[PDB]
Design a protein around this ligand. Sequence first.
Ligand code: HEC
Ligand code: HEC
Ligand code: HEC
Ligand code: HEC
Ligand SMILES: [Cl-]
Ligand SMILES: [Cl-]
Ligand SMILES: [Cl-]
Ligand SMILES: [Cl-]
Ligand SMILES: [Cl-]
Ligand SMILES: [Cl-]
Ligand SMILES: [Cl-]
Ligand SMILES: [Cl-]
Ligand SMILES: [Zn+2]
Ligand SMILES: [Zn+2]
Ligand SMILES: [Zn+2]
Ligand SMILES: [Zn+2]
Ligand SMILES: [Zn+2]
Ligand SMILES: [Zn+2]
Ligand SMILES: [Zn+2]
Ligand SMILES: [Zn+2]
Ligand SMILES: [Zn+2]
Ligand SMILES: [Zn+2]
Ligand SMILES: [Zn+2]
Ligand SMILES: [Zn+2]
Ligand SMILES: [Zn+2]
Ligand SMILES: [Zn+2]
Lengths: 106, 106, 106, 106
Amino acid sequence: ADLEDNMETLNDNLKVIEKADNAAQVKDALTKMAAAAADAWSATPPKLEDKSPDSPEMHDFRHGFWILIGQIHDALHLANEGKVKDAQEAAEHLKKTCNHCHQKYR
Amino acid sequence: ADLEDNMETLNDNLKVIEKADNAAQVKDALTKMAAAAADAWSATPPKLEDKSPDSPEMHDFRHGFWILIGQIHDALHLANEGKVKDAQEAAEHLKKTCNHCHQKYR
Amino acid sequence: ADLEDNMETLNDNLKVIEKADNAAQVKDALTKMAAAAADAWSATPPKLEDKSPDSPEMHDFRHGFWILIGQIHDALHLANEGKVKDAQEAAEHLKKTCNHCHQKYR
Amino acid sequence: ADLEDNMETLNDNLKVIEKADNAAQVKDALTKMAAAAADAWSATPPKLEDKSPDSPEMHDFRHGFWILIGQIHDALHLANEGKVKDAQEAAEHLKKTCNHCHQKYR
Ligand code: HEC
Ligand code: HEC
Ligand code: HEC
Ligand code: HEC
Ligand SMILES: [Cl-]
Ligand SMILES: [Cl-]
Ligand SMILES: [Cl-]
Ligand SMILES: [Cl-]
Ligand SMILES: [Cl-]
Ligand SMILES: [Cl-]
Ligand SMILES: [Cl-]
Ligand SMILES: [Cl-]
Ligand SMILES: [Zn+2]
Ligand SMILES: [Zn+2]
Ligand SMILES: [Zn+2]
Ligand SMILES: [Zn+2]
Ligand SMILES: [Zn+2]
Ligand SMILES: [Zn+2]
Ligand SMILES: [Zn+2]
Ligand SMILES: [Zn+2]
Ligand SMILES: [Zn+2]
Ligand SMILES: [Zn+2]
Ligand SMILES: [Zn+2]
Ligand SMILES: [Zn+2]
Ligand SMILES: [Zn+2]
Ligand SMILES: [Zn+2]
């Protein structure tokens, strides 16, 4: 998928996790979010099309996806230990990473 | 130090980071925060004085400090990389971790 | 790219890191490794072609790539910090992750 | 405890984890190792007594304890998801961090 399809995957599943009921629903949305972050890691955002692929802005862009993957990694370990409430609550951590990247690059 | 003392070190140095005007003030405040979080790791908070050292509650409490130490680790790399504004902005990430432990265990 | 291609990118760039003589060769090889690990994240390896996408086996396989991405993240911060020899030495950490996945899933 | 008492705690429990049988035995040794790493984070090793507390050697010293705490964090999530074999095997990851610090500072 392109970067916008990955953003739509992240937006949708972040909501499937706010409104979540059962466990394998939080587990499955975090898995789809991790797939979308990893897939998006290599993309160039439109605001940076004109920049060197190894410009400080593209280095910082890719770093935001490392932070988000690190957060989905911990939340999925919480969800897989039966701590499903604490995994939902990890949403508030994620949104903050969503907003930091959007502030500079969307 | 006791948990109350470590928290005041966290609170003070987080204020230093938000208001800092040079790179050395941010690095130094991040190192002091890491020392306080590491020291707090061993503490039993008041609401859990009755629970055992290896209870689920005390397991989950200590996990909160690993998250915080993880964030300070990343912010200090940003700071030692020249990316000092980005290190300052990691303060917004830390507060979420501060609030989350407070909501559950304070 | 396919899993075989991503592995050859991992193998080649790991060799570049061990034999590199300037900072730019280490950074560039670490970024290429991160791109290949992120791309490999989606793959199904041969020994697990019969297992489902959300099987325990495929969960554990993907976890191996999070570990590797985590290590490359840390090594690149060491490299962008001036600590280039320490970034080169992180290669010894990566190989352990390479061997561990190979022992279980290759 | 001082730095040598923490090293003896890490050495002992790393062995309790090679020879481990049950689960709460691997869980309890990883917990004691995490306590010892956090406690040791603030110490000054004898080889660096003569160095600035914020010298590159003391910064790199404390960084080794971040890496080890990060590894114990992941292994304890593996042990707490019933993946007790994969948690034992995390020993090989840890030993490599033991050796890197010892190479420069013990
Ligand atoms: C950078 C490291 C980012 C992170 C982390 C997240 N997003 Fe993002 N997002 C980013 C960019 C550069 C863009 C713009 C892309 C473009 O082609 O214009 C976006 C866009 C979105 C959108 C809008 C999609 C659309 O229909 O145009 C959404 C709804 C969105 N992003 C959601 C989102 C969520 C929920 C995130 C975290 C969970 C998140 N993004 C992280 C860059 C980055
Ligand atoms: C748990 C994992 C915590 C994290 C992370 C942080 N704090 Fe904390 N804090 C915690 C507890 C259990 C308590 C109560 C301790 C007691 O014995 O009374 C506190 C207390 C504080 C306080 C002041 C005391 C109060 O209001 O009762 C402050 C100012 C404070 N904490 C700040 C703080 C900051 C800034 C943090 C992150 C950077 C932070 N805390 C993290 C538990 C935990
Ligand atoms: C799983 C999480 C893996 C990690 C991490 C690494 N590798 Fe890998 N590698 C993996 C599989 C399943 C396979 C077999 C793929 C197939 O379809 O045949 C491989 C294969 C290789 C190969 C060559 C192929 C072979 O011997 O069959 C190489 C050279 C290789 N991998 C190198 C490599 C390196 C250097 C890694 C870390 C830096 C690494 N791999 C990580 C699964 C996984
Ligand atoms: C630095 C970041 C270190 C890490 C990670 C680990 N160790 Fe260590 N260890 C370190 C120092 C500086 C020293 C010397 C301290 C001194 O006062 O001389 C040590 C020492 C040991 C020892 C010897 C203890 C003794 O009786 O003198 C042991 C047995 C030991 N360390 C074990 C150990 C293990 C098992 C580790 C990881 C699991 C480990 N250490 C990590 C510095 C660092
Ligand atoms: Cl990660
Ligand atoms: Cl998980
Ligand atoms: Cl525990
Ligand atoms: Cl750095
Ligand atoms: Cl899964
Ligand atoms: Cl850095
Ligand atoms: Cl950690
Ligand atoms: Cl855990
Ligand atoms: Zn965790
Ligand atoms: Zn898992
Ligand atoms: Zn951020
Ligand atoms: Zn004060
Ligand atoms: Zn980082
Ligand atoms: Zn550093
Ligand atoms: Zn939280
Ligand atoms: Zn090749
Ligand atoms: Zn680091
Ligand atoms: Zn960087
Ligand atoms: Zn491993
Ligand atoms: Zn993990
Ligand atoms: Zn846990
Ligand atoms: Zn190392």
